[PDB]
Amino acid sequence: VKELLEAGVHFGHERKRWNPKFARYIYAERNGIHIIDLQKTMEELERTFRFIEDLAMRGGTILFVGTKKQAQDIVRMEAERAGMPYVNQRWLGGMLTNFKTISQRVHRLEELEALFASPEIEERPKKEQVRLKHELERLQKYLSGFRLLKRLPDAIFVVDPTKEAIAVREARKLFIPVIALADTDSDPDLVDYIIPGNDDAIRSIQLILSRAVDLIIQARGGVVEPSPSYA
RNA sequence: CCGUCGUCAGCUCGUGCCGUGAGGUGUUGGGUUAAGUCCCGCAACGAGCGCAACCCCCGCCGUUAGUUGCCAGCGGUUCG
Ligand SMILES: [Mg+2]
Ligand SMILES: [Mg+2]
Ligand SMILES: [Mg+2]
Numbered sequence: 475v476k477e478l479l480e481a482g483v484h485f486g487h488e489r490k491r492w493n494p495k496f497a498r499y500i501y502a503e504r505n506g507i508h509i510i511d512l513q514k515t516m517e518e519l520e521r522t523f524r525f526i527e528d529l530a531m532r533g534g535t536i537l538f539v540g541t542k543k544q545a546q547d548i549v550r551m552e553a554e555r556a557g558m559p560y561v562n563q564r565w566l567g568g569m570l571t572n573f574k575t576i577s578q579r580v581h582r583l584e585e586l587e588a589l590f591a592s593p594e595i596e597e598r599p600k601k602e603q604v605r606l607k608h609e610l611e612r613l614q615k616y617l618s619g620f621r622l623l624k625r626l627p628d629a630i631f632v633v634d635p636t637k638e639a640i641a642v643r644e645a646r647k648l649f650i651p652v653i654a655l656a657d658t659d660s661d662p663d664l665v666d667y668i669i670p671g672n673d674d675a676i677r678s679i680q681l682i683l684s685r686a687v688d689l690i691i692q693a694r695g696g697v698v699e700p701s702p703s704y705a
Numbered sequence: 706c707c708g709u710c711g712u713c714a715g716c717u718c719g720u721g722c723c724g725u726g727a728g729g730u731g732u733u734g735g736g737u738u739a740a741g742u743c744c745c746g747c748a749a750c751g752a753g754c755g756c757a758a759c760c761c762c763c764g765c766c767g768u769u770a771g772u773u774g775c776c777a778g779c780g781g782u783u784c785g
């Protein structure tokens with residue numbers, strides 16, 4: 475499952491826009507660029523996946539965090555493939571720390587599902603349709619992956635702990651383990667299970683996500699061959 | 706019970722987040738409207754009292770009804 479042709483996909487980026495805590499996972503600066511010791515990536519995959527694999531067979535949910543436009547679509551395929559929740563658009567404040575309240579806003583979604591599946595009155599004003607439809611069209615935009623989540627995840631898995639510091643912040647306050655693919659602009663000490671790698675190139679996001687999705691499905695009852703990606 | 710600022714676009718709440726704390730946040734920000742009006746954005750997410758709507762008068766048309774009201778037509782018409 476592990477693989478070594480990762481250097482055929484990322485080895486890292488971003489110059490002196492670095493975070494000094496990450497130096498322990500950096501090989502050298504060549505291309506005017508911080509370069510990640512890929513060896514140092516394997517070590518942490520071994521330990522991180524052990525967590526994920528051990529987390530797999532226990533039948534426990536995982537929240538998928540990626541919202542930079544470089545990792546936007548690629549998380550949506552993969553979280554569904556493993557049948558687990560994600561956030562694609564905005565990470566709402568209090569998704570975790572205020573779950574019962576945020577998820578009180580999925581009950582409005584599930585309730586819209588039914589109402590627009592006929593009939594429960596269509597003699598409701600034309601303009602109210604206009605209003606309700608768009609609201610469904612609005613709600614749908616954000617919550618499509620969060621709706622699966624019906625309880626606090628036993629872990630969360632992140633693309634950018636720097637870009638999604640808020641997510642990381644809530645998880646911490648809820649003692650939830652934090653997992654993340656994360657490059658040198660990020661804060662290492664902040665993540666429990668670290669995948670020290672490029673977090674912007676779609677290449678790198680595909681390799682590390684999918685193979686982690688596969689490790690999840692492998693120990694969660696079955697296996698399957700390849701998954702969708704743009705070249 | 707009333708005047709009043711003021712028919713002005715405002716005033717808050719629940720939870721979460723922030724601050725030792727008063728409190729902030731949301732309610733700020735772009736745009737739009739008669740309006741916290743609606744949109745877009747966002748550690749905020751919703752809820753409430755207000756705005757608006759629902760009620761009355763007027764402007765067009767219709768159905769129903771035709772006296773004490775009306776008279777288009779015809780006939781009588783002392784001439785109403
Ligand atoms: Mg990065
Ligand atoms: Mg509060
Ligand atoms: Mg202060």
Ligand SMILES: [Mg+2]
Pocket residue numbers: none
């Ligand atoms: Mg406090």
Ligand SMILES: [Mg+2]
Pocket residue numbers: none
């Ligand atoms: Mg307060």
Ligand SMILES: [Mg+2]
Pocket residue numbers: 732
């Ligand atoms: Mg105000």
Ligand SMILES: [Mg+2]
Pocket residue numbers: 732
């Ligand atoms: Mg205020």
Ligand SMILES: [Mg+2]
Pocket residue numbers: none
């Ligand atoms: Mg404004």
Ligand SMILES: [Mg+2]
Pocket residue numbers: 712739740
């Ligand atoms: Mg006004």
Ligand SMILES: [Mg+2]
Pocket residue numbers: none
């Ligand atoms: Mg309003």
Ligand SMILES: [Mg+2]
Pocket residue numbers: 731747
């Ligand atoms: Mg706001």
